[model samples]
Target: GLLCYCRKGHCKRGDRVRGTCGIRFLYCCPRR
Candidate 1:
């Protein structure tokens, strides 16, 4: 799994970006 804090609404490629706790974003990479 992958995670990242981004202000943007979405990740550019592959896995998309999300949000949590009312701050930043979450980039989750499904496979490894």
Candidate 2:
């Protein structure tokens, strides 16, 4: 699922960026 607690905004938010970049970070989406 493209949704979860990303460690920000009440620790419950989808932190994703362009392409397949998805990571639960405190700030800025981590490219993996």
Candidate 3:
């Protein structure tokens, strides 16, 4: 249940990143 604002790096499960567009919700799930 984690969220993040996407930047230039990559995001893994449980970790998320927001998009630069400022209109879309981008998130990633933790992978093991």
Candidate 4:
């Protein structure tokens, strides 16, 4: 999984998910 910052609803729909931090959401994105 890749860790990165995303918009509030950016990662709403995916195999990936969110781990919020620092006024933004950090996403846990799975490999395609």
The number of the candidate with the highest lDDT is: 4
Worst 10 residues of 2 by lDDT: 4-13
Which residue pairs collide in model 4, if any?
A: none
Question: What digit string (tens of lDDT, one per residue) describes model 4 on residues 1-32?
Answer: 45544545446455466465445545556445
lDDT of 3 by residue, 8-31 (tens): 345654454443423343445433
Q: Write the per-residue lDDT of candidate 1 for residues 1-32, one digit (tens) a residue.
A: 46544434455566544544244454444333
Per-prediction count of colliding residue pairs? 1, 0, 7, 0
Per-residue CA lDDT of model 2 for 1-32, tens digit only, reads: 33422443323234343332235334334333
The RMSD of every model to the true structure, in order and in angstroms, is: 4.3, 9.9, 5.9, 3.3
CA-lDDT, candidates in order: 0.46, 0.36, 0.44, 0.52
Candidate 1: list runs displaced more than 4 Å: 1-3, 16-32
Could you give the candidate ranking by TM-score, starting with the highest? 4, 3, 1, 2
In what order do the candidates fall by lDDT, top score first? Answer: 4, 1, 3, 2
Give the 10-residue window scoring lowest on summed lDDT in candidate 3: 21-30
Distance from true position, residue 28, model 2, in Å? 0.3
